[PDB]
Design a protein around this ligand. Structure first.
Ligand SMILES: [Mg+2]
Ligand SMILES: [Mg+2]
Ligand SMILES: [Mg+2]
Ligand SMILES: [Mg+2]
Ligand SMILES: [Mg+2]
Ligand SMILES: [Mg+2]
Ligand SMILES: [Mg+2]
Ligand SMILES: [Mg+2]
Ligand SMILES: [Mg+2]
Ligand SMILES: [Mg+2]
Ligand SMILES: [Mg+2]
Ligand SMILES: [Mg+2]
Ligand SMILES: [Mg+2]
Ligand SMILES: [Mg+2]
Ligand SMILES: [Mg+2]
Ligand SMILES: [Mg+2]
Ligand SMILES: [Mg+2]
Ligand SMILES: [Mg+2]
Ligand SMILES: [Mg+2]
Ligand SMILES: [Mg+2]
Ligand SMILES: [Mg+2]
Ligand SMILES: [Mg+2]
Ligand SMILES: [Mg+2]
Ligand SMILES: [Mg+2]
Ligand SMILES: [Mg+2]
Ligand SMILES: [Mg+2]
Ligand SMILES: [Mg+2]
Ligand SMILES: [Mg+2]
Ligand SMILES: [Mg+2]
Ligand SMILES: [Mg+2]
Ligand SMILES: [Mg+2]
Ligand SMILES: [Mg+2]
Ligand SMILES: [Mg+2]
Ligand SMILES: [Mg+2]
Ligand SMILES: [Mg+2]
Ligand SMILES: [Mg+2]
Ligand SMILES: [Mg+2]
Ligand SMILES: [Mg+2]
Ligand SMILES: [Mg+2]
Ligand SMILES: [Mg+2]
Ligand SMILES: [Mg+2]
Ligand SMILES: [Mg+2]
Ligand SMILES: [Mg+2]
Ligand SMILES: [Mg+2]
Ligand SMILES: [Mg+2]
Ligand SMILES: [Mg+2]
Ligand SMILES: [Mg+2]
Ligand SMILES: [Mg+2]
Ligand SMILES: [Mg+2]
Ligand SMILES: [Mg+2]
Ligand SMILES: [Mg+2]
Ligand SMILES: [Mg+2]
Ligand SMILES: [Mg+2]
Ligand SMILES: [Mg+2]
Ligand SMILES: [Mg+2]
Ligand SMILES: [Mg+2]
Ligand SMILES: [Mg+2]
Ligand SMILES: [Mg+2]
Ligand SMILES: [Mg+2]
Ligand SMILES: [Mg+2]
Ligand SMILES: [Mg+2]
Ligand SMILES: [Mg+2]
Ligand SMILES: [Mg+2]
Ligand SMILES: [Mg+2]
Ligand SMILES: [Mg+2]
Ligand SMILES: [Mg+2]
Ligand SMILES: [Mg+2]
Ligand SMILES: [Mg+2]
Ligand SMILES: [Mg+2]
Ligand SMILES: [Mg+2]
Ligand SMILES: [Mg+2]
Ligand SMILES: [Mg+2]
Ligand SMILES: [Mg+2]
Ligand SMILES: [Mg+2]
Ligand SMILES: [Mg+2]
Ligand SMILES: [Mg+2]
Ligand SMILES: [Mg+2]
Ligand SMILES: [Mg+2]
Ligand SMILES: [Mg+2]
Ligand SMILES: [Mg+2]
Ligand SMILES: [Mg+2]
Ligand SMILES: [Mg+2]
Ligand SMILES: [Mg+2]
Ligand SMILES: [Mg+2]
Ligand SMILES: [Mg+2]
Ligand SMILES: [Mg+2]
Ligand SMILES: [Mg+2]
Ligand SMILES: [Mg+2]
Ligand SMILES: [Mg+2]
Ligand SMILES: [Mg+2]
Ligand SMILES: [Mg+2]
Ligand SMILES: [Mg+2]
Ligand SMILES: [Mg+2]
Ligand SMILES: [Mg+2]
Ligand SMILES: [Mg+2]
Ligand SMILES: [Mg+2]
Ligand SMILES: [Mg+2]
Ligand SMILES: [Mg+2]
Ligand SMILES: [Mg+2]
Ligand SMILES: [Mg+2]
Ligand SMILES: [Mg+2]
Ligand SMILES: [Mg+2]
Ligand SMILES: [Mg+2]
Ligand SMILES: [Mg+2]
Ligand SMILES: [Mg+2]
Ligand SMILES: [Mg+2]
Ligand SMILES: [Zn+2]
Lengths: 79, 63, 49
RNA sequence: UCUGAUCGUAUUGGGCCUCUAACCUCGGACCGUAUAUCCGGUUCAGGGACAGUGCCUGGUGGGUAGUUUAACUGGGGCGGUUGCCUCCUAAAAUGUAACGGAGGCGCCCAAAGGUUCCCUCAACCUGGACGGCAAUCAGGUGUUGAGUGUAAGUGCACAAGGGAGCUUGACUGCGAGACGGACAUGUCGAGCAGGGACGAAAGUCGGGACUAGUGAUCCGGCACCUCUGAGUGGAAGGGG
RNA sequence: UGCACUACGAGUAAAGAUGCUCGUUACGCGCGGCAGGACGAAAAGACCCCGGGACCUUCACUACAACUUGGUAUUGGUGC
RNA sequence: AAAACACAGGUCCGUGCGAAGUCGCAAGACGAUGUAUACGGACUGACGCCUGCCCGGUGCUGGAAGGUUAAGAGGACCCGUUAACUCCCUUUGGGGGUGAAGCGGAGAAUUUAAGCCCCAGUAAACGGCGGUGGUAACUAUAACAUCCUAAGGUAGCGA
RNA sequence: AAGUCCAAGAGUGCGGCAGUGAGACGGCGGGGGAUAAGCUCCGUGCGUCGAGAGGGAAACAGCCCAGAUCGCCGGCUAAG
RNA sequence: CUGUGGGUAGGGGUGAAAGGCCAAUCAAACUCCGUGAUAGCUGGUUCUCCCCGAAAUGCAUUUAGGUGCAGCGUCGCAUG
RNA sequence: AGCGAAAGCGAGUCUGAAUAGGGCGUAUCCACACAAGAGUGUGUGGUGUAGUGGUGUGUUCUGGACCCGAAGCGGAGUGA
RNA sequence: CUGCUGUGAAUCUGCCGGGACCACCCGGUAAGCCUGAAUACUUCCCAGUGACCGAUAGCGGAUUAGUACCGUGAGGGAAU
RNA sequence: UAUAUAGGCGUCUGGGGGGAACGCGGGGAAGUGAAACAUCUCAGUACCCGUAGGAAGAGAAAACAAAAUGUGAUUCCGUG
């Protein structure tokens, strides 16, 4: 007459936060995730909870490097 | 009769030189051992009250 | 408790700088480690209070 | 002049048997008082420093008084549930409800933290005394099916998995820029300086492969500080 | 007692219609009767839920009366 | 309007006397111009035969060797203030340490009542009254060995 | 990159004044239920009703057409 | 049984006990006063036109028919 | 005239060991330089900074506070 | 500052206060008593005034008005 | 019952009751608010009791103050 379940946790709002070709500031976090689904690419660092962030200003762009999806920051030219 | 300032809110909120109302962050009075110092120091100093709460806090402060 | 809260104090100035936990079943003796003392200015041994 | 077995004086308590004089008697008589089971007085007879009563104090105390006794909910009740974490529902961004479908949490580890270096499992075949498919040895095949403290998911063989050395960064002063957000919470973070660890150096280190292991404010405790101190100096008290 | 020159049937509609649809029936006005309907009148449902009361019970809470303990004042004397 | 209340009868408990109980802040009053063959309270309910067990729980009553405990007496020890010094270290001061008395603050040992724990009695006090393992007359009709308790339904009655 | 641009009467920021926090059915994707309900619970730069008049569906909030500034004894059409 | 006179008063009285009765009222009489008690509840709130125009969701809630903040309307200013 | 818990200092001030970052503050705009394109800063000049008191309107606070409505609670009295 | 209870001093090199307390300084002189003015109100009397009402208004009462009437009573209480 | 007192007799002089508000000294709620409620509030309010006066009460420092060669009884009003 009772359900032995009915509990869940809060949604953590994970996922890609900046997509390809998007200009970011240095320090912006770019994708929140659990494991390493996206590996840190060139000029992109990885946080303690596996959060990828940008170590330099530029444009986001994804890639594959030896069978590993990677995220990179590309230096846009100064006008 | 002259209006009364809400005393519980005056000992919690303060105004700066320009007139924005500042605050004190919570979760820093006890049970501190398990909190990393990064969490501890992102929780101190003042911070401006939200625009959503600025309307009621103003009425509590002016009475 | 078996993992109680403990405090560490510098020997050369007796100031309590850090609070941590440890297992009393596994570390019955006072825990001592070389920590950093803000007023001594350098790393000093710190012993359980 | 301490150690002691001692008597006495001055003083003050604890107790005991008493005495009467406070106080008490609805015991008698007499009087105010012609009238009076009131009342007061006088006196005899009894208690008696007790009792009663003030003040302070501990018990017992529905005798009375004021009140409280949650919500969700396919009506209500009875059951079950209430915070956090993971997955599916959830319709390939995020978010998404039901008493929808499954499980975990309220810890643990002074190493199971930091760094430096080194290694690759599980399973299967073959050869070996106990020893059997199975325990340890040797040869081979074996790219991940093993393992990762702990649920599940995302990861990890480049290893985040296995082993050893040293060691405490399970730091102090901070923090550009952001994610998430009714708000309050929360989450990531390069980089600078102090003082260190490891490393030849490059460099990495603000606990743990990651996401649970938690409780706002009030009020109070404690240690430290260069703050304050109700005329002044202290203190008490407050403050950081 | 909102009205008014207030039929029926099968429907439709806040799901049980005199008043809407489509058809059927019906000259106008009364008197005596009957109670099928007007979810008829009456009484801001008393059942049930929600909020609030009130009185009752008790090892609910917190108090107080009452009862009781001791100290001390009233309260003193001699002997041990 | 009843089967309910009352009742005459029964018991239990309290009360030694301006009793106990009740109405009152008190004085005072009823009880009662009564005095345990009386009065109050509780249950039962003429009569007849009877009224089992359990005192562990909770009350009531009684007791005291201990444990625990208020106010009150006690003020060891500590802290504040400062007469005095005593020193530097710079000089007409000013901080270090000690610090008597006096006044203040926190106050331990020690001592002390009832209650509670404790131990007894009490059920016409509020209350409670069991099973299992395998069995025969023609099936029976629960009254062989053992577990548990404070004790395991007595008499009578019983769709 | 354009479009719309004498308008969407559009975004965003600050402020004054709000109401709302009982939604309904229909189309598509689903949970609960018996792949029942005019059932219940979610998603939808989906619609309409709510807060919508007019025409169609006999009548018939939520379906189809179409959004009522007023007048006309003009014309053309939409669903049907 | 009854007449006349009298006594008991509201958390009180009285009850051969039904919560009975105490002035047509009683699980605490009535009158006045506190007082215009308080009600997250129901009801009502009065002339006109012009422009714009919702929500019935999220989060928290001694919370679930109430409220706060967000979302969504309007007006003023800024930007464009 | 602000910063600071405060002593205090003052176009600064707090934190800090830091001419080392950040917080708050120095109306606002203009230019010229000197530094980096990690979001612009720093500095020299310039411009120079707007409040207050009546009163209308909207909302609000304290008051019965838009109007109406309990069952009930208290004080003092009236009734056998 | 002050009530009830207990204990209980000094007469000026005294005693009190200056937000626990102590020291120093300063102010004052308790346990005795009187005291005008400036301040509060209007039963009643006089004289006035009103961007006050004008007979369902204004006092309950423009008229038999605390009247008639209702109640055992406190009390309620018109209409003209 | 001796001292005597309690009492008794006589002769005077006062007291008593009423009143709308204002004063002073005492006793002292609850509705309510706190979105429950008990501290708290309401509120020392309502009510009650004792007493006045034309006003009352207070009043002549055992006060403030803060190092100023400062104020100087009380009451009331405005600020703070
Ligand atoms: Mg999840
Ligand atoms: Mg890490
Ligand atoms: Mg204040
Ligand atoms: Mg703290
Ligand atoms: Mg810390
Ligand atoms: Mg060890
Ligand atoms: Mg005595
Ligand atoms: Mg006594
Ligand atoms: Mg009680
Ligand atoms: Mg009660
Ligand atoms: Mg109440
Ligand atoms: Mg409720
Ligand atoms: Mg409910
Ligand atoms: Mg149900
Ligand atoms: Mg149902
Ligand atoms: Mg998704
Ligand atoms: Mg999707
Ligand atoms: Mg949803
Ligand atoms: Mg669980
Ligand atoms: Mg590890
Ligand atoms: Mg290590
Ligand atoms: Mg091998
Ligand atoms: Mg490893
Ligand atoms: Mg730690
Ligand atoms: Mg930041
Ligand atoms: Mg370094
Ligand atoms: Mg770092
Ligand atoms: Mg971590
Ligand atoms: Mg609080
Ligand atoms: Mg002082
Ligand atoms: Mg001082
Ligand atoms: Mg201190
Ligand atoms: Mg029909
Ligand atoms: Mg029909
Ligand atoms: Mg019809
Ligand atoms: Mg018609
Ligand atoms: Mg007829
Ligand atoms: Mg009829
Ligand atoms: Mg008839
Ligand atoms: Mg009816
Ligand atoms: Mg109703
Ligand atoms: Mg109810
Ligand atoms: Mg009969
Ligand atoms: Mg009858
Ligand atoms: Mg009966
Ligand atoms: Mg008898
Ligand atoms: Mg008995
Ligand atoms: Mg007696
Ligand atoms: Mg007897
Ligand atoms: Mg009987
Ligand atoms: Mg019998
Ligand atoms: Mg018996
Ligand atoms: Mg027994
Ligand atoms: Mg027993
Ligand atoms: Mg017993
Ligand atoms: Mg016994
Ligand atoms: Mg006893
Ligand atoms: Mg004492
Ligand atoms: Mg039978
Ligand atoms: Mg366009
Ligand atoms: Mg337009
Ligand atoms: Mg618009
Ligand atoms: Mg709601
Ligand atoms: Mg809703
Ligand atoms: Mg809906
Ligand atoms: Mg529906
Ligand atoms: Mg569907
Ligand atoms: Mg479903
Ligand atoms: Mg439906
Ligand atoms: Mg839909
Ligand atoms: Mg509506
Ligand atoms: Mg329409
Ligand atoms: Mg519409
Ligand atoms: Mg269509
Ligand atoms: Mg045509
Ligand atoms: Mg056509
Ligand atoms: Mg008679
Ligand atoms: Mg009579
Ligand atoms: Mg009664
Ligand atoms: Mg009457
Ligand atoms: Mg009656
Ligand atoms: Mg009553
Ligand atoms: Mg009552
Ligand atoms: Mg009131
Ligand atoms: Mg009202
Ligand atoms: Mg419009
Ligand atoms: Mg709102
Ligand atoms: Mg707005
Ligand atoms: Mg300031
Ligand atoms: Mg700090
Ligand atoms: Mg700065
Ligand atoms: Mg102006
Ligand atoms: Mg204005
Ligand atoms: Mg009443
Ligand atoms: Mg009477
Ligand atoms: Mg005087
Ligand atoms: Mg009139
Ligand atoms: Mg007229
Ligand atoms: Mg009238
Ligand atoms: Mg009469
Ligand atoms: Mg008089
Ligand atoms: Mg109250
Ligand atoms: Mg309340
Ligand atoms: Mg309320
Ligand atoms: Mg005068
Ligand atoms: Mg006078
Ligand atoms: Zn140190």
């Amino acid at each position: 007459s009772s359900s032995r379940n009915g509990r869940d946790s809060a949604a953590q709002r994970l996922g890609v936060k900046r997509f390809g070709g998007q200009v970011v500031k240095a320090g912006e976090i770019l994708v929140r995730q659990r494991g390493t689904h996206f590996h840190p690419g060139v000029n992109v660092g990885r946080g303690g909870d596996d959060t990828l962030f940008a170590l330099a200003p530029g444009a986001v762009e994804f890639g594959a490097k030896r069978g590993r999806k990677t995220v990179n920051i590309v230096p846009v030219a100064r006008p | 009769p002259k209006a009364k300032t809400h005393s519980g809110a005056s000992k919690r909120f303060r105004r700066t030189g320009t007139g924005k109302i500042v605050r004190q962050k919570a979760n820093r009075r006890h049970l501190l051992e398990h909190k990393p110092t990064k969490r501890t120091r992102r929780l101190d100093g003042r911070t401006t009250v939200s625009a959503a709460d600025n309307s009621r806090i103003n009425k509590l402060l002016n009475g | 408790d078996v993992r109680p809260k403990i405090t560490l104090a510098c020997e050369v100035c007796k100031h309590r700088n850090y609070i941590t936990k440890k297992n009393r079943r596994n570390d019955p003796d006072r825990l001592e480690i070389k920590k950093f003392c803000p007023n001594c200015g350098t790393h000093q041994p710190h012993k359980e209070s």
